[PDB]
């Protein structure tokens, strides 16, 4: 077995292999997430609609359990591995314990997996950040994020990937009790945030959300152009009718 130490500290106290992993995350398709009160939303930017492609076989959005799901940004292959490992842990948390998987628990698990891979011989870290979504059954709806370092925090809303810095600067200036105070408007802020950096076309997005009790729902490109018009023109009822 290969025992080389891949991730090591440097003169000033840095872990380059982690910082490099973090860089791969940066070169990834933007991904934003907003935490509402009745429905949490997530949308995956730069979906490079090559058309000759096939939507289903590449959606940067996935469900882990029946009460949790996630979005990622970074090395595609890595994500797969991490996705299917959390999926497994989800069912195994039910065989050891009887109750289901929590909002945080599963996120912590993923963070622990990533952290480990930054301190084990023979391994490279995972080049992906994750936006984990889900409502705390018998409680509030939560949102969490993870980066290669293995650190994790709960966000009110957030973005990771290409230009996530921008979308983040934006999100920080649009989130309010009022802004998206209803499922109709909640799924909106994301739509705006994504677009606020998302290439022209709308055929570059792939949003979707989960209800505080219902299964998951991957929106159709139809309900897309609609909510992409309810604001495409709403971006004129104050920008073309007051400008």
In the complex, the residues that contact other proteins under the rule CB under 8 A are 1-17, 20-27, 50-54, 56-58, 75-78, 80-81, 84, 111-112, 114-115, 118-127, 144, 149-158, 168, 171-172, 175
Sign of CA dihedral 10, 15, 17, 23: negative
Find the part of the chain contacting Mg ion (CB under 5 A) among 18-26, 113-121, 136-144, 166-174: 166-174
Cα 93 to Cα 8, 64, 87, 200, 216, distances in angstroms: 32, 12, 10, 43, 21
The least distance separating Mg ion from the CB of residue 132, rounded to whole angstroms, comes to: 12
Asked whether position 53 contacts Mg ion by CB under 5 A, the answer is yes
Give the other-Cβ count within 10 Å of 26's Cβ: 16
Closer by beta carbon to Mg ion, 40 or else 159: 159
Task: Rank residues 122 and 234 by Cβ distance to other proteins and give the closer one.
Answer: 122
Tell me how far apart the alpha carbons of residues 68 and 28 are, in angstroms, rounded to a whole number.
23
Q: Which does 76 bind (CB under 5 to 8 A by kind): Mg ion, other proteins, none?
A: other proteins
Nearer to Mg ion, 90 or 197 (CB): 197
Q: DSSP characters for 163-194?
A: THHHHHHHHTTT--SSTT-SHHHHHHHHHHHH
227 interacts with, out of Mg ion, other proteins, none, CB within 5 to 8 A per kind: none
Nearer to Mg ion, 119 or 166 (CB): 166
Q: Are the C-beta atoms of residues 49 and 7 closer than 8 Å to each other? A: no
Q: What is the DSSP letter of 69?
A: E
**Using CB under 5 A as the criterion, which residues of the chain lie in contact with Mg ion when the complex forms?**
53, 158-159, 168
């Amino acid at each position: 077995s290969y025992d080389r130490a891949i991730t090591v500290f440097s003169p000033d106290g840095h872990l380059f292999q982690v910082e490099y992993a973090q860089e791969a995350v940066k070169k990834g398709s933007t991904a934003v997430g907003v935490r509402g009160r009745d429905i949490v939303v997530l949308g995956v930017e730069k979906k490079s609609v090559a058309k000759l492609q096939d939507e289903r076989t590449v959606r940067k959005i996935c469900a882990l359990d029946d009460n949790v799901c996630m979005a990622f940004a970074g090395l595609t292959a890595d994500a797969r591995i991490v996705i299917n490992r959390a999926r497994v842990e989800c069912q195994s948390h039910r065989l050891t314990v009887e109750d289901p998987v929590t909002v945080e628990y599963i996120t912590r698990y993923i963070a622990s997996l990533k952290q480990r891979y930054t301190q084990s011989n023979g391994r490279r870290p995972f080049g992906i950040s994750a936006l984990i979504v889900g409502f705390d059954f018998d409680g509030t709806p939560r949102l969490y994020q993870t980066d290669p370092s293995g650190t994790y925090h709960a966000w009110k809303a957030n973005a990771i990937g290409r230009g996530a810095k921008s979308v983040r600067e934006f999100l920080e200036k649009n989130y309010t009790d009022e802004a998206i105070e209803t499922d109709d408007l909640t799924i909106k802020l994301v739509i705006k945030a994504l677009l606020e950096v998302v290439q022209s076309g709308g055929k570059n997005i792939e949003l979707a959300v989960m209800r505080r009790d219902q299964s998951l729902k991957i929106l159709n490109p139809e309900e897309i152009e609609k909510y992409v018009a309810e604001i495409e023109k709403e971006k004129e009822e104050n920008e073309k009718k007051k400008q």
